[PDB]
Amino acid sequence: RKEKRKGWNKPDAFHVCIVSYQLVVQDQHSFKRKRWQYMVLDEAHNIKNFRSTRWQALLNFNTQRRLLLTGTPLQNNLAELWSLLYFLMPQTVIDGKKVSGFADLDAFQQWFGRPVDKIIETGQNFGQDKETKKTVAKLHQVLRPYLLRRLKADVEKQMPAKYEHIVYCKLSKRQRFLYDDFMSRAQTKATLASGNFMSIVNCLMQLRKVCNHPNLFEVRPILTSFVLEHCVASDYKDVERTLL
Amino acid sequence: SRSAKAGLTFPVGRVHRLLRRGNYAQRIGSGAPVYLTAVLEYLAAEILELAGNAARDNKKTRIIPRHLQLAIRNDDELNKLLGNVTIAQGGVLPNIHQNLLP
Amino acid sequence: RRTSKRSSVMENTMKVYEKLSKAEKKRKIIQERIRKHKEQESQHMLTQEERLRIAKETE
Amino acid sequence: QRLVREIAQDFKTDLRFQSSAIGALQESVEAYLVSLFEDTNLAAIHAKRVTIMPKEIQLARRLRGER
Amino acid sequence: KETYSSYIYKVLKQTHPDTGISQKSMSILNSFVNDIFERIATEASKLAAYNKKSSAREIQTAVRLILPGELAKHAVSEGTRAVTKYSS
Amino acid sequence: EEVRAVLKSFLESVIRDSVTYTEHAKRKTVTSLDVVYALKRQGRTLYGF
DNA sequence: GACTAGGGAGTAATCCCCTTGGCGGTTAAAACGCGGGGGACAGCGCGTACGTGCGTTTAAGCGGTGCTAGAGCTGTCTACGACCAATTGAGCGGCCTCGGCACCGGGATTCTCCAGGG
DNA sequence: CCCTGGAGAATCCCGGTGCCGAGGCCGCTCAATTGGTCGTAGACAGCTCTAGCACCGCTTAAACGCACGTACGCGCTGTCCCCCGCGTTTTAACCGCCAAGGGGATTACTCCCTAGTC
Numbered sequence: 001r002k003e004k005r006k007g008w009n010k011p012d013a014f015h016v017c018i019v020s021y022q023l024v025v026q027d028q029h030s031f032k033r034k035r036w037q038y039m040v041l042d043e044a045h046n047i048k049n050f051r052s053t054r055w056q057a058l059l060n061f062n063t064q065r066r067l068l069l070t071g072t073p074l075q076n077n078l079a080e081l082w083s084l085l086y087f088l089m090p091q092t093v094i095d096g097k098k099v100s101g102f103a104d105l106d107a108f109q110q111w112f113g114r115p116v117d118k119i120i121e122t123g124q125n126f127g128q129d130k131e132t133k134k135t136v137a138k139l140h141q142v143l144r145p146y147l148l149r150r151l152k153a154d155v156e157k158q159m160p161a162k163y164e165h166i167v168y169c170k171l172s173k174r175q176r177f178l179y180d181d182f183m184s185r186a187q188t189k190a191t192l193a194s195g196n197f198m199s200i201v202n203c204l205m206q207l208r209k210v211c212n213h214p215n216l217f218e219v220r221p222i223l224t225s226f227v228l229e230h231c232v233a234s235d236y237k238d239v240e241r242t243l244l
Numbered sequence: 245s246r247s248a249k250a251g252l253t254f255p256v257g258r259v260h261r262l263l264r265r266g267n268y269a270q271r272i273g274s275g276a277p278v279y280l281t282a283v284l285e286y287l288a289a290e291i292l293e294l295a296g297n298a299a300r301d302n303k304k305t306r307i308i309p310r311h312l313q314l315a316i317r318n319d320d321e322l323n324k325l326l327g328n329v330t331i332a333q334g335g336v337l338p339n340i341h342q343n344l345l346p
Numbered sequence: 347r348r349t350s351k352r353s354s355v356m357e358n359t360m361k362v363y364e365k366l367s368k369a370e371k372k373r374k375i376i377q378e379r380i381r382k383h384k385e386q387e388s389q390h391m392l393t394q395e396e397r398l399r400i401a402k403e404t405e
Numbered sequence: 406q407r408l409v410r411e412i413a414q415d416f417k418t419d420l421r422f423q424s425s426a427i428g429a430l431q432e433s434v435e436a437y438l439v440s441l442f443e444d445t446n447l448a449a450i451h452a453k454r455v456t457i458m459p460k461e462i463q464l465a466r467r468l469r470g471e472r
Numbered sequence: 473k474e475t476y477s478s479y480i481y482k483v484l485k486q487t488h489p490d491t492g493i494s495q496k497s498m499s500i501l502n503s504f505v506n507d508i509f510e511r512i513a514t515e516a517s518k519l520a521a522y523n524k525k526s527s528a529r530e531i532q533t534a535v536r537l538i539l540p541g542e543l544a545k546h547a548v549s550e551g552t553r554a555v556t557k558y559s560s
Numbered sequence: 561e562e563v564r565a566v567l568k569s570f571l572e573s574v575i576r577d578s579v580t581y582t583e584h585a586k587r588k589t590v591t592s593l594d595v596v597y598a599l600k601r602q603g604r605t606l607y608g609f
Numbered sequence: 610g611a612c613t614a615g616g617g618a619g620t621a622a623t624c625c626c627c628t629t630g631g632c633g634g635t636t637a638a639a640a641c642g643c644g645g646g647g648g649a650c651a652g653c654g655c656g657t658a659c660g661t662g663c664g665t666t667t668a669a670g671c672g673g674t675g676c677t678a679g680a681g682c683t684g685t686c687t688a689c690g691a692c693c694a695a696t697t698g699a700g701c702g703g704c705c706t707c708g709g710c711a712c713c714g715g716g717a718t719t720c721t722c723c724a725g726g727g
Numbered sequence: 728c729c730c731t732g733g734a735g736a737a738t739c740c741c742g743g744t745g746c747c748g749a750g751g752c753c754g755c756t757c758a759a760t761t762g763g764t765c766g767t768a769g770a771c772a773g774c775t776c777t778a779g780c781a782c783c784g785c786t787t788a789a790a791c792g793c794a795c796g797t798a799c800g801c802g803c804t805g806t807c808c809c810c811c812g813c814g815t816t817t818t819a820a821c822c823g824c825c826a827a828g829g830g831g832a833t834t835a836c837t838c839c840c841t842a843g844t845c
Binding site for chain 2: 689690691699700708709710
């Protein structure tokens with residue numbers, strides 16, 4: 001890596017550098033120096049939260065043009081969208097007085113936000129579209145300047161379709177024993193007093209048992225006899241030898 | 245003040261209160277209770293000058309703890325005075341045996 | 347003793363520091379001229395045809 | 406930290422160590438060890454030897470009467 | 473709590489007007505000053521117990537065997553000059 | 561092996577002295593300042609804490 | 610004298626930020642193994658520098674002496690230090706910078722190895 | 728026999744940008760000065776007394792030279808064994824992912840505490 005940074009400061013050494021998400025933070029000291037004309041974030045959803053050091057190590061990065069590519073902005077909250085807008089937008093510029101911030105993570109809660117995940121998560125009544133259309137239209141208008149999405153409707157002349165199929169699998173006898181034991185133990189522990197604390201491990205190991213079944217704790221073993229080893233011959237060997 | 249009238253700068257009264265609390269004697273010597281502060285001031289001036297010189301040697305404006313380390317360790321008299329006490333984040337003078345070299 | 351052993355050490359090490367500062371200045375100017383020579387020997391004015399020539403060779 | 410906890414749990418539980426304390430003993434032990442090692446280096450360069458063996462370490466430990 | 477940072481700072485400033493300090497070095501100096509003070513002060517206490525009785529001669533003599541003589545004569549001389557300055 | 565023995569003979573002794581000191585201080589916790597007392601009585605004092 | 614009106618506390622619902630565990634991904638430090646070579650050490654020879662026996666003297670202990678100047682205790686006083694608080698300023702508790710420190714790159718400079726001939 | 732041109736590679740060093748904290752600035756703040764007392768402990772002789780300075784003549788006990796002599800620290804020889812530099816692998820912390828409580832604040836309903844006049 002150092003040998004590849006040998007001609008790093010040469011003005012005409014290279015034009016494009018490809019770097020992983022786990023190496024920008026590792027070598028942010030050596031990356032924050034060079035002036036980058038363009039920066040692109042592939043799979044932009046890899047950064048979605050405002051708590052990670054991944055976003056912070058790139059917020060103050062010295063670049064003027066930023067582009068984020070993602071398959072689809074998704075998950076439960078729009079905080080991911082707000083963080084993405086901040087990352088493309090960032091107000092913190094060397095001048096520091098233009099105050100060109102998009103909108104605060106809390107200031108975006110008034111502008112749609114809480115109504116969006118309120119109505120959307122209650123999509124049964126979302127067909128009313130009396131006040132829901134207001135927030136949806138506001139989000140569409142506010143995202144139109146920076147958005148570009150095209151589904152498979154643009155290319156359909158030669159496109160094989162997707163056929164979703166769900167396969168149901170039964171439960172084996174000993175794995176059923178394992179599942180019942182674990183699930184009854186978890187329901188007796190979590191619902192009342194317990195040890196230190198344990199509530200997500202129940203679901204996780206239940207998932208493990210449903211997924212794999214007869215492993216992750218024990219296998220069918222290679223049966224062999226017990227090896228009781230004290231014996232009694234050596235106790236009386238001395239007495240016998242003395243006698244004869 | 246008392247230090248100003250004495251030409252000193254260390255707070256003498258704080259040391260007087262410390263010695264009164266320590267009760268090393270019922271009636272401490274009040275003829276010159278800042279004298280024990282004066283000798284410490286002289287020693288502090290010595291060590292501060294040596295530390296400042298050491299920091300100036302390696303082009304660093306601020307007193308590096310290592311700079312103070314070599315400042316105290318270089319002086320044989322200082323080593324005799326304080327040699328059984330270590331310093332946090334200190335160091336060791338580069339001492340390579342001549343006969344060790346190939 | 348002599349009230350000047352520490353002061354003599356001061357004098358020696360401050361002469362050393364003055365020599366170090368002189369070395370600092372001369373190395374500053376020598377790398378300034380090094381950078382000047384590098385700029386003169388560096389590539390200038392890629393323009394269009396030359397940049398496309400280097401681009402097609404790299405291609 | 407693992408070694409400190411292992412050697413300290415043999416006395417009392419809920420010790421609640423403060424990381425500054427373990428840093429202090431860490432600095433103390435490294436300083437003592439480097440002093441020891443330079444002393445045994447001197448004790449070895451005494452003899453026509455440049456490789457350190459238990460004899461020098463034992464001699465250095467016994468000479469100062471640590472225990 | 474009364475820290476001693478101001479006094480050491482001004483001593484450094486009157487002996488080096490452009491040299492800074494580090495936070496670790498501040499604690500280093502504070503501990504050095506404190507433990508030297510305690511060491512010489514208990515030495516003075518044992519020197520008071522030395523004489524079959526309950527000043528400045530005790531402290532001068534105590535600094536006279538605790539630290540190397542070369543700096544010890546300067547210490548006692550400057551202490552005496554300080555008490556002469558403070559006398560009137 | 562011998563260096564590991566030096567740790568096993570050096571760390572634990574100052575650990576015992578430190579814990580009995582902080583017990584003598586009636587403090588149900590250990591602070592960095594408690595190590596300094598042990599270092600002072602062991603003949604190897606450390607500055608900075 | 611009977612009942613009326615309004616607002617902060619009592620009761621309560623919302624939010625929502627804050628973390629407990631587990632698990633996967635990925636880099637760095639630790640862990641393990643080989644060719645070969647330089648460090649450890651035996652075997653030995655010797656010389657010369659002490660290990661030792663005996664003559665021939667200066668010197669500490671011996672044996673005692675005649676005192677002589679410094680050390681311990683007896684009054685005695687008096688200069689001074691440990692006893693309240695008003696103070697009021699020397700200095701610390703909390704915050705806000707821009708600068709020296711952190712640290713890496715291009716280059717000059719320098720430190721080291723070899724297979725040959727010189 | 729042994730010296731080195733070339734090459735590989737570590738060093739010294741100053742640009743050269745980002746960061747966080749050392750030092751300055753602000754707001755209390757509590758402890759050293761200072762008036763006095765009053766009585767405590769050490770300086771100032773003073774009488775005393777007690778060990779040492781130098782002196783004398785002995786007494787062989789140590790001290791030193793001389794000669795033998797002899798064996799050990801050191802330096803020569805050789806081998807051998809074992810630890811390092813480098814190449815390949817595996818624990819080892821660290822940071823992201825998720826769905827659920829805990830709780831702390833935060834605000835809404837309301838309900839009693841408060842207080843006015845026909």
